């Protein structure tokens, strides 16, 4: 049907049809008479999978022969979503499969919906890893993603009586056609035990062994015939485990619990032993695999060349144990001297920081590490001593600097600061947006920057334009390709060419047409799947992201209520109609976030059923927000809410997705919003509120929320409504915790940005009244979104950190 | 190479080779440069599997169209062994695959050894179920095996310091290419809860739900294009299970533990809750599946026709809960009246008894059933009341009969006798050999036989001649086929034609040649795999079966020591050389059985290293006895030890395997030995010892072991040797428990058969000195082994119990 979806040749369509029928028969053991739609999905997935394997085998053959420097991306999260459409896109197979399935009497889009998300992440950090894998393969890098194969990913969110309920994400129930078990590369991982000292150094003995079994998933590059590997470890008990008899077999579960479930915390540290075990498990298995691959290479014992052949990227501090584990292996097993081992480690490792929120920083109790990983604690103590000796020599007599920079934190319970470990043991430390990287050098890591300034870098985040434009918004990808060709898909900077179409009446009409179609499709999805009705002519106002106080879903709530109250006051006055959509999951133990969800639904209950409002205002909570839902809602959005308190959202990536898909942005000067506004021009963004400097000024004086309550009558009314039980008639005090937080202990200064936010929203409504000028501003956003491709991000990592050159060159097919 | 292995056509070999290469590439994601032997096994298995699916689909299509009466074989054990060679045999593919793999540069026999046994059974009962599935498919019956998919089968046995050690049989580690998950037919199973009474009868409420997910494995008939199904259930927690968050997900393990591990008890009842849950789990899921299939049929609500379309065979009492579960469904859910439901149940169910040992009988505590299955207990009480009302009417005033026949056993703890439940609720009750079925009517079920004589039948056990001749002994199958053709493989009675070859000098030579080749091959296997050396010219004296006091491995031990002591007394006297091989697993909690294993190895330690003995006597313990090992050792055997105390081994099936494979039998008149001797002629068997009647006479008088000790000097010497520490110099009292048992509390009268046993063994040695006459007797055994084909057994079940006609007719290919 459309150009960007590739060719549907007679030869290819015929071959796909017969291979589809082969899999249905031989693989699924079914025929057309008994086959369910799920069977048809699997037949298609196996058919597409077949096209991957030849390229997969020859890519890994190529790496073995050429022996390039290998990039190892270590992450506890890979938020992959669905794989079928992505694979078709990257292989130029979409139209052919569409035709083949059409001729078999099937609707391909219907089959696509059957696939489970691989929801092995929480939000931004996990999705960044997924975008990164796509870009590394597209740029021809010899890259491997290493993580854990969770049996249960992020929970499925159900809303019951307005409250969030969690259920197990049993994503492997029907099987995963994309993965290949590799039980032949199973590796032992050690826990507990004790340290023994001999003539030949230290020995870690009396350990408990858990096996790590790898599962490999292919990662196709965009039309370059490169297929890289994501290798995820699964925990397995050894066969002599605990070996009355029956109980010993049943107790195998204890070891295998390591890879059972993803910790559902977004930007929050929980110091549980099982989490620590997960972190070491991924690190220990991965490092053995890396070293094995290094020794068994065409290069040729000598670890001097280790950093020339290996780069390890730590995604946050979660895999920080890679640093002392590498030291352990090099010193204890390979018998290298400390100084040489340390040189190798530092040159190999690099660390990406994802947040400055104190509650998200990993600080492990010494007593946990003492019991679980006794040798690693000893190594960390030695790292600390040698590091602090360097600090003392650089800043003599500065005793407070010594305590501030220590990897060991003193107190009631001694803790290890994993961020400090990462900085000391890495040759590069990066933040994820310009403002964030500056904040790191000026505030939380100031001491480290003063000691080693060369270590600190910026790498602004990005998103893959394959998943986040071509896949989810084919209508927009096509109208763009009509004007400027297809090269932009792997060179997003080419979107700048669209600036010469801002006055083109044909293009203006097509851009607006694509948005309306997307909105109609999403309005239809909501009715079919959730029996909720919306007006497709209204402004689609959306905030989708994890529920967090710093992200200020509550500020959005205050605006919604302001709009409702203004309508109730002057009912016969015209207002631009809005559909306000808010979605995202709360961590199960995060009480305030659960209360915010309940608030949003409670507002909906009042607003959506008030006859005086009509279809002028609707508030909908988008249930079970996840990658597949993002692919549907983002292309449908008109307004993107990016309203974190300045200085709290390190980068954001949802913001970039909305920009690429034709939504305008209302936001604070926070994270990547700053660079987005810079790229598009401030005139083409809806920027409001305190800057970082204004927040600091308010902190020094002291934030008093009562001041705002006293001086803003519209804000006062809302607080009275919440307190009196207007939004909860049967439980009048339901939201007392929310009011109390807002009035007395609000770390994120919701009230301080309220006035500017509401006024800015008025400007948004004004522009939306003029469709032509709205669309022209939209074109100016899309056209300048090029910087935010993860291809740009990865090229910077490659050149400035990993010391490798990207390549757009095709491998032979 | 050999005729019975089928044709190796140019077309077929070419097609197999290319499909092998396809699977290696697409399925395993490998090439010839990186492939391991395990990869090659899997490529072959997938290639052979492909040939099954077409036949599998059309068989199940055929059953849906013809709607025959369906046979449901319910068992907690299916001792399947390996599947690759069996599938090739039944599909006439062995020579073609042999040729195809040879041309690819691979040895097929080497690849076959890589396959894990499906060890989902303990011994005789589980292996009988496997033979039965093979015969039902071969005889064209619409039959389904239903059981549990254990994650861990029977433990792997390691011998360490002479002691048995157990390790987990992680048979699914590398995957199972033969099974197909069918998550679409997942069914809920209920536990706990309480019974509620309404106007519309009883309701079982507040239950815990566990899901049952089926996995289907194909069961090919011998060259008839029939492929039946074995459906095994796996336990799965529902997604809202226990739904702080992390622990609730981890607690899913509790529900899923139901299908985790096979209880490793052979002929011994252990009253643990997990076992009861397993028993109900298989029954509840299976019955729902049966009823679904019955309702969704081309026949056409009315349960009057249920017994005309359904037969349920209970393999022992393990699935006895089928009786009250069927009543529950019919009465509580379908709203049939009790009397009608009961008629249907009785006409549907039939029960096979496997032993008369009191310790093996299932007697469940009422308090367990009360908590776990409250509705089932109520139904059992009602069944009991109505049954005992019938007894009272038939035998008025006989109050002791009432207590004896009750399903409820009175005492300190009330128990339900599951055997009594089975008899009351089945239209047929059978023993497994003529003597066993007679014992049932005369002793343990005498009261029931008097009430309902028509119910009691015999069905002598059998073995499949596909696995137990063609597969494991191709050399013998071939020399037989040369004379009488190939028809005997599915009509074993044709072996009688071999009686006209007993004086044929060519045949005599070939039979003896096949045995020597088998012995050389097994002697080579022992050296390669266990570094143990044996003399292939010696008599191979073997006892392989589970370790049990009733099976009297201890009597064998006494003979071995007698032979050793006689050699030591007259060293320069000629004795027929023997290799005594004993193998089998002991239940982990069975102390005495573990002591017997240690004794056997301890005798070996003395005998095998005595220079005066030389290579005249060797004692070897065969480690990890299982189906695949049986296939190797049985064709190599000269002498089969079947020496259970008369009246204790219900049938035996190992005995039949040895007879079919050219070993002579030394045994008591017990189980099927009686019918074997009857078939071959007593002159061609080595029968010794007490008959059942002699055992009873000894019991009435009182068994005094001291008498035998006092009157037999050779027996006295052995007991002194055991007591003094001759076989355990460092631990002189190691075997005190064995001696004490033998002298004071021997239920199985080892001493009473000692004299006759030793004398009979002398007669065996005498015959072995004359190779020609040994072989002639062997031919007389093989020729009369026809009755013991499981095809005969299944034909009898079909005609006399299930009311269906067997068919040797081919389905179209
Ligand atoms: O995970 C890995 N998988 C591999 O196949 N290799 C190597 O690639 C070579 C060519 O495919 C193989 O010989 C193997 O050593 C490797 O080092 N790591
Ligand atoms: O386990 C079962 N699998 C099936 O396929 N069937 C039925 O067989 C028919 C023809 O293959 C199907 O329509 C299904 O109803 C069935 O009853 N039980």
């Amino acid at each position: 049907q459309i150009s960007v979806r590739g060719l549907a040749g007679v030869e290819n369509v015929t071959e796909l049809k017969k291979n589809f029928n082969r899999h249905l028969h031989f693989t699924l053991v079914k025929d057309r008479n008994v086959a369910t739609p799920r069977d048809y999905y699997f037949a298609l997935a196996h058919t597409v999978r077949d096209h991957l394997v030849g390229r997969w085998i020859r890519t890994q053959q190529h790496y073995y022969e050429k022996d390039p420097k290998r990039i190892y991306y270590l992450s506890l999260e890979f938020y992959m979503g669905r794989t079928l459409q992505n694979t078709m896109v990257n292989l130029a197979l979409e139209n052919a499969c569409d035709e083949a399935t059409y001729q078999l009497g099937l609707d391909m889009e219907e089959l696509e919906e059957i696939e489970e998300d691989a929801g092995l992440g929480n939000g931004g950090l996990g999705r960044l890893a997924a975008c990164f894998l796509d870009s590394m393969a597209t740029l021809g890098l010899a890259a491997y993603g290493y993580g854990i194969r969770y049996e249960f990913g992020i929970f499925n969110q159900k809303i019951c009586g307005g409250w969030q309920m969690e259920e197990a994400d049993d994503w492997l129930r029907y099987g995963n056609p994309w993965e290949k078990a590799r039980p032949e590369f199973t590796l032992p991982v050690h826990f507990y035990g004790r340290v023994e000292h001999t003539s030949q150094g230290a020995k870690w003995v009396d350990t408990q062994v858990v096996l790590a079994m790898p599962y490999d998933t292919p990662v196709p590059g965009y039309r370059n015939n490169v297929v890289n590997t994501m290798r995820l470890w699964s925990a397995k008990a050894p066969n002599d485990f605990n070996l009355g008899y029956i109980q010993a077999v049943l107790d195998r579960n204890l070891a295998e619990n390591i890879s059972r479930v993803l910790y559902p915390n977004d930007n929050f540290f929980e110091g549980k032993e099982l989490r620590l075990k997960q972190e070491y498990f991924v690190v220990a298995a991965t490092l053995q695999d890396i070293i094995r691959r290094f020794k068994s290479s065409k290069f040729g014992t000598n670890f001097d060349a280790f950093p020339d052949k290996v780069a390890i990227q730590l995604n946050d501090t979660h895999p920080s144990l890679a640093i002392p584990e590498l030291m352990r292996v090099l010193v204890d097993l390979e018998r290298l001297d400390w100084d040489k081992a340390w040189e190798v480690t530092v040159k190999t490792c690099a660390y990406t920081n994802h947040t400055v929120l104190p509650e998200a920083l990993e600080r492990w109790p010494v007593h946990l590490l003492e019991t679980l990983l006794p040798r690693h604690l000893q190594i960390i103590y030695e790292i600390n001593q040698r590091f602090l000796n360097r600090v003392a020599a650089a800043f003599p007599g500065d005793v407070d600097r010594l305590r501030r920079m220590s990897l060991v934190e003193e107190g009631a319970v001694k803790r290890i600061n994993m961020a400090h470990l990462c900085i000391a043991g890495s040759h590069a430390v990066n933040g994820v947006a310009r403002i964030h990287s500056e904040i790191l050098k000026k505030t939380i890591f100031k001491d480290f920057y003063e000691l080693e300034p060369h270590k600190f870098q910026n790498k602004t985040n990005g998103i893959t334009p394959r998943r986040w434009l071509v896949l989810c918004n084919p209508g927009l990808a096509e109208i763009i390709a009509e004007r400027i060709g297809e090269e932009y898909i792997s060179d997003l900077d080419q979107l700048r060419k669209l600036l010469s179409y801002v006055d083109d009446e044909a293009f203006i009409r097509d851009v607006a047409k694509v948005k309306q179609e997307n909105k109609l499709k999403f309005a239809a999805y909501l009715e079919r799947e959730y029996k909720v009705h919306i007006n497709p002519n209204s402004l689609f106002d959306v905030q989708v992201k994890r529920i967090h106080e710093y992200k200020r879903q509550l500020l959005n709530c205050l605006h919604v209520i302001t709009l409702y109250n203004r309508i109730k006051k002057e009912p016969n006055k015209f207002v631009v109609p809005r559909t306000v959509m808010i979605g995202g999951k709360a961590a199960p133990g995060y009480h305030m976030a659960k209360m915010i969800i309940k608030l949003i639904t409670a507002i909906g209950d009042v607003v959506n059923h008030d006859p005086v409002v009509g279809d002028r205002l609707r508030v909908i909570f988008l249930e079970n927000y996840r990658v597949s839902l993002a692919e549907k809602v983002i292309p449908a959005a008109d307004l993107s809410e990016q309203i974190s308190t300045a200085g709290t959202e390190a980068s954001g990536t949802g913001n970039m997705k909305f920009m690429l898909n034709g939504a305008l942005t209302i936001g604070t000067m926070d994270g990547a919003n700053v660079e987005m506004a810079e790229e598009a021009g401030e005139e083409n963004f809806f920027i409001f509120g305190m800057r970082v400097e204004d927040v600091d000024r308010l902190d020094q004086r002291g934030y008093n929320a009562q001041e705002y309550y006293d001086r803003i009558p519209e804000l006062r009314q809302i607080i009275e409504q919440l307190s009196s039980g207007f939004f909860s008639p049967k439980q009048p005090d339901l939201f007392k915790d929310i009011v109390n937080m807002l009035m007395h202990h609000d770390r994120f200064k919701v009230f301080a940005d309220y006035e500017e936010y509401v006024k800015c929203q008025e400007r948004v409504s004004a522009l939306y009244k003029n469709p032509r000028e709205w669309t022209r501003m939209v074109i100016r956003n899309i056209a300048t979104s090029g910087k935010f491709s993860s291809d740009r991000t990865i090229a910077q990592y490659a050149r400035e950190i990993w010391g490798v050159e990207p390549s757009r060159q095709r491998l032979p097919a």
Side-chain angles (χ1 to χ4, degrees), chain A:
Chain A
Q1 191 170 317
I2 65 158
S3 153
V4 287
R5 283 190 169 192
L7 291 319
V10 194
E11 209 109 298
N12 269 50
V13 172
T14 304
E15 191 72 21
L16 288 165
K17 278 162 69 188
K18 88 172 223 287
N19 284 299
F20 182 98
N21 285 325
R22 183 176 53 80
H23 278 116
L24 185 73
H25 182 84
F26 291 104
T27 302
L28 305 180
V29 195
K30 296 268 187 162
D31 64 9
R32 297 298 307 263
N33 302 314
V34 298
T36 55
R38 174 162 285 107
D39 298 310
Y40 292 132
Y41 157 70
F42 277 102
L44 182 49
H46 281 101
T47 299
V48 175
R49 175 196 172 271
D50 280 351
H51 287 272
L52 274 168
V53 301
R55 297 157 163 102
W56 203 10
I57 292 165
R58 76 190 313 158
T59 305
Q60 309 302 326
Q61 233 151 218
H62 180 66
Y63 296 158
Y64 180 71
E65 299 291 336
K66 284 223 159 198
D67 194 37
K69 180 169 192 186
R70 266 102 170 186
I71 313 307
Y72 296 106
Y73 197 84
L74 269 59
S75 187
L76 266 88
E77 299 184 22
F78 287 95
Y79 212 167
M80 298 297 271
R82 295 168 175 160
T83 295
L84 180 55
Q85 202 181 349
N86 190 241
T87 301
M88 291 191 287
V89 171
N90 282 11
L91 264 38
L93 250 27
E94 206 167 12
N95 271 336
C97 290
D98 199 16
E99 186 60 34
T101 53
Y102 177 79
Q103 286 177 22
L104 264 14
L106 301 163
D107 187 353
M108 191 167 75
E109 289 197 354
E110 185 191 306
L111 271 26
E112 284 167 349
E113 292 297 319
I114 292 145
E115 181 173 9
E116 291 290 327
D117 283 46
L120 308 187
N122 278 284
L125 167 156
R127 180 60 230 179
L128 190 77
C131 285
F132 278 13
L133 293 183
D134 181 83
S135 288
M136 290 181 303
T138 292
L139 294 180
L141 299 177
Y144 305 72
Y146 274 94
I148 299 169
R149 186 189 178 259
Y150 303 106
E151 189 171 328
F152 300 93
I154 189 66
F155 62 88
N156 283 313
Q157 177 193 61
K158 296 264 201 75
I159 303 299
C160 294
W163 301 98
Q164 168 176 297
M165 304 290 292
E166 302 88 22
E167 63 170 43
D169 168 47
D170 193 15
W171 75 291
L172 296 162
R173 180 168 66 245
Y174 298 101
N176 174 5
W178 309 110
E179 70 186 5
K180 180 67 188 73
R182 295 299 203 198
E184 59 267 30
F185 312 131
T186 298
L187 261 26
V189 177
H190 296 263
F191 294 98
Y192 304 101
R194 62 184 167 86
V195 179
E196 213 169 66
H197 298 275
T198 60
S199 305
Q200 264 66 226
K203 279 223 282 273
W204 187 19
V205 299
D206 289 355
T207 54
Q208 288 181 26
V209 175
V210 179
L211 301 181
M213 179 181 290
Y215 286 74
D216 293 357
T217 294
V219 182
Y222 181 74
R223 270 108 105 151
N224 63 174
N225 301 318
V226 170
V227 179
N228 287 341
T229 298
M230 176 182 66
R231 174 163 284 182
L232 305 180
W233 302 100
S234 191
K236 263 270 193 164
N239 287 333
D240 58 357
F241 186 81
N242 287 166
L243 286 166
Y245 169 75
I246 296 290
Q247 199 61 51
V249 175
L250 298 183
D251 283 352
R252 288 170 63 93
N253 301 155
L254 276 31
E256 306 180 342
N257 279 346
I258 290 161
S259 58
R260 198 82 72 202
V261 63
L262 169 72
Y263 274 83
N265 304 308
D266 185 77
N267 290 262
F268 184 81
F269 170 64
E270 195 182 345
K272 295 299 200 305
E273 190 199 35
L274 186 58
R275 171 68 173 196
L276 184 50
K277 286 174 168 192
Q278 290 187 331
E279 291 181 349
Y280 182 64
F281 178 74
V282 63
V283 157
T286 297
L287 273 176
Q288 290 179 80
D289 214 30
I290 289 168
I291 288 160
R292 182 197 47 77
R293 199 175 284 110
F294 170 75
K295 288 178 169 193
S296 307
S297 66
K298 197 169 261 69
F299 188 79
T301 329
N302 176 236
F303 284 90
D304 290 286
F306 194 77
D308 295 319
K309 292 288 161 189
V310 177
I312 297 167
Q313 196 64 41
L314 313 172
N315 195 26
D316 213 314
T317 59
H318 314 151
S320 66
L321 289 167
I323 292 157
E325 174 66 12
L326 186 47
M327 286 297 287
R328 187 188 73 84
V329 177
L330 297 179
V331 174
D332 293 357
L333 307 179
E334 300 294 331
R335 314 287 199 196
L336 272 73
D337 66 275
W338 187 276
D339 287 346
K340 179 58 208 174
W342 186 245
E343 184 179 316
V344 169
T345 301
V346 173
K347 285 164 79 178
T348 300
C349 297
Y351 158 63
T352 303
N353 176 277
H354 282 276
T355 181
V356 304
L357 298 184
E359 62 265 40
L361 294 193
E362 292 197 293
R363 286 152 59 250
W364 286 106
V366 163
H367 64 84
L368 271 172
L369 289 164
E370 201 170 283
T371 309
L372 192 75
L373 302 164
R375 183 59 187 142
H376 294 83
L377 218 218
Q378 298 183 350
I379 286 158
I380 287 166
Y381 281 151
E382 184 74 24
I383 289 168
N384 191 49
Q385 185 200 301
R386 292 168 182 264
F387 184 69
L388 289 183
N389 284 167
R390 272 172 43 81
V391 177
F395 302 98
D398 196 344
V399 289
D400 203 68
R401 191 180 287 256
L402 289 177
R403 73 148 206 95
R404 290 197 311 264
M405 294 184 76
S406 179
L407 313 202
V408 183
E409 285 189 3
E410 207 56 49
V413 289
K414 297 223 293 181
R415 295 170 184 271
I416 307 295
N417 187 318
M418 304 317 268
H420 290 185
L421 205 214
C422 285
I423 296 157
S426 302
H427 77 274
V429 177
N430 76 284
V432 288
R434 188 209 292 142
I435 192 165
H436 171 57
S437 299
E438 289 302 307
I439 284 171
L440 294 180
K441 298 190 278 178
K442 290 206 278 276
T443 66
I444 66 163
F445 303 139
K446 178 174 185 283
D447 292 326
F448 298 85
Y449 174 70
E450 287 170 0
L451 181 68
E452 305 175 293
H454 57 273
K455 209 171 265 197
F456 292 80
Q457 297 189 29
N458 177 239
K459 297 289 170 279
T460 303
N461 277 172
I463 55 163
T464 178
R466 272 76 66 187
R467 184 170 300 268
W468 300 111
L469 180 56
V470 185
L471 191 154
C472 68
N473 206 350
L476 180 59
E478 183 65 1
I479 65 165
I480 292 165
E482 287 180 1
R483 317 301 196 286
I484 67 165
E486 281 183 24
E487 290 189 329
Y488 74 92
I489 297 166
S490 53
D491 192 14
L492 209 61
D493 284 317
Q494 289 203 30
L495 290 182
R496 281 201 173 264
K497 291 178 192 173
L498 296 175
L499 251 20
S500 59
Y501 294 94
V502 75
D503 294 305
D504 196 303
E505 210 68 31
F507 195 60
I508 291 167
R509 170 164 39 251
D510 286 345
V511 173
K513 182 189 91 298
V514 163
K515 183 59 65 175
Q516 190 48 47
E517 287 183 345
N518 287 340
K519 293 172 67 173
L520 283 164
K521 191 190 184 176
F522 189 74
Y525 175 83
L526 284 179
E527 286 183 38
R528 283 177 70 256
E529 215 85 354
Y530 298 100
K531 305 295 164 191
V532 283
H533 296 87
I534 55 161
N535 173 24
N537 291 125
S538 62
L539 193 163
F540 281 16
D541 180 350
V542 6
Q543 188 179 202
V544 289
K545 51 188 72 237
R546 288 291 297 259
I547 313 300
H548 262 278
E549 281 166 277
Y550 89 87
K551 290 167 186 290
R552 299 201 298 187
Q553 283 87 6
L554 277 178
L555 182 58
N556 198 163
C557 288
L558 295 182
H559 177 246
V560 166
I561 299 170
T562 304
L563 251 40
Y564 174 76
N565 286 342
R566 284 172 176 189
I567 294 165
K568 290 289 282 189
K569 196 177 181 67
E570 301 179 306
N572 306 118
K573 199 260 228 74
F574 176 84
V575 291
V576 173
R578 291 198 187 211
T579 300
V580 182
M581 303 176 198
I582 302 171
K585 289 167 188 187
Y590 193 170
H591 177 254
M592 192 54 67
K594 282 188 164 176
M595 287 314 294
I596 295 163
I597 292 173
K598 176 59 175 173
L599 212 219
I600 297 158
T601 63
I603 292 160
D605 286 350
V606 167
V607 173
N608 300 349
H609 302 110
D610 191 321
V612 176
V613 172
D615 66 345
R616 295 188 283 172
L617 184 62
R618 289 276 180 269
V619 187
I620 278 90
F621 187 84
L622 260 28
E623 177 180 283
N624 203 26
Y625 181 66
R626 64 195 186 279
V627 175
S628 69
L629 192 59
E631 293 169 3
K632 295 183 179 71
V633 70
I634 297 174
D638 291 311
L639 216 220
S640 171
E641 304 266 5
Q642 309 295 333
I643 59 175
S644 52
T645 312
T648 63
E649 188 78 79
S651 175
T653 53
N655 52 183
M656 300 165 188
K657 305 176 195 172
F658 282 97
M659 190 187 185
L660 190 54
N661 278 280
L664 295 183
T665 300
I666 187 167
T668 54
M669 281 298 201
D670 197 19
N673 294 0
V674 179
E675 290 163 80
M676 290 166 57
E678 179 177 318
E679 290 299 300
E682 287 194 52
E683 335 85 63
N684 301 308
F685 258 72
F686 296 101
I687 298 145
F688 76 93
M690 296 182 287
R691 314 309 202 247
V692 170
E693 295 78 19
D694 300 311
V695 177
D696 289 346
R697 268 162 78 247
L698 232 189
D699 278 333
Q700 283 167 12
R701 189 169 76 245
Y703 174 68
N704 180 212
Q706 186 78 35
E707 177 171 302
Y708 299 93
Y709 177 93
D710 284 342
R711 322 220 278 216
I712 311 159
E714 278 187 304
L715 184 63
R716 188 181 319 117
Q717 182 183 4
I718 300 172
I719 301 306
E720 291 194 63
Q721 282 174 319
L722 291 174
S723 300
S724 65
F726 185 84
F727 295 97
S728 55
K730 286 191 181 172
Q731 315 164 71
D733 76 313
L734 188 67
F735 300 115
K736 66 163 184 158
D737 288 341
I738 295 179
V739 177
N740 190 69
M741 183 276 279
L742 255 18
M743 296 293 281
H744 305 293
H745 317 96
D746 185 7
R747 297 169 63 209
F748 307 104
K749 305 167 175 61
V750 171
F751 286 8
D753 282 332
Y754 170 85
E755 267 201 308
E756 271 209 46
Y757 180 53
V758 168
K759 279 147 81 165
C760 189
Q761 285 279 24
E762 291 175 349
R763 299 200 291 114
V764 169
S765 291
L767 218 219
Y768 197 81
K769 268 149 75 188
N770 189 338
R772 182 193 141 84
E773 294 302 324
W774 180 273
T775 303
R776 286 176 79 249
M777 196 174 281
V778 164
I779 292 154
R780 290 191 276 260
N781 276 237
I782 300 172
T784 56
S785 65
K787 180 182 166 176
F788 307 106
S789 165
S790 47
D791 301 342
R792 186 273 309 157
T793 308
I794 289 297
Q796 290 182 315
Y797 276 93
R799 297 184 180 114
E800 306 174 17
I801 298 167
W802 304 327
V804 293
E805 282 301 313
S807 172
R808 266 273 72 192
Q809 293 171 122
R810 258 95 276 201
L811 281 182

